[PDB]
Amino acid sequence: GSSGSSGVRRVPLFENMDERLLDAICERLKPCLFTEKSYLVREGDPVNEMLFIIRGRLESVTTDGGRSGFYNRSLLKEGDFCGDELLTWALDPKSGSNLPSSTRTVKALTEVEAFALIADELKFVASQFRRSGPSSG
């Protein structure tokens, strides 16, 4: 592609995370791209890997709940992350009830450009670091 400036500019997700944890997680980033009819996250289904939107577009759709009609369609802005729950999942070792779940169902309508992130590698680097303490602050 190009490889220049990485997203996660001012993302809250990586608030507690440390640089070392970033690079590590970054080093995990694998070369992959999403095409038409490409499902990133699925509501109700487990999450194997997370996708960090670097630069592209996507469509958010829901099934459960809703209002006026059916399936509330929507769009995500730039830097929008899906299955973010995974991030926490890894950050949460206590949570050992199978892979996490997505918040909504997103798809790829146009050529998207982002990387992939496996929970395993995540949790690994997550636990390895393990930086929380007796809730200080």
Swiss-Prot record:
Domain notes: The binding of calmodulin to the C-terminus might interfere with cyclic nucleotide binding and thus channel activation.
Protein localization: Cell membrane
Family: Belongs to the cyclic nucleotide-gated cation channel (TC 1.A.1.5) family.
Range within the parent protein: 509 to 632 of 747
Organism: Arabidopsis thaliana (Mouse-ear cress)
Name of the molecule in the record: Probable cyclic nucleotide-gated ion channel 6
Subunit record text: Homotetramer or heterotetramer.
Amino-acid positions noted as binding a nucleoside 3',5'-cyclic phosphate in the UniProt annotation, renumbered to this chain: 13-131
Protein's job: Probable cyclic nucleotide-gated ion channel.
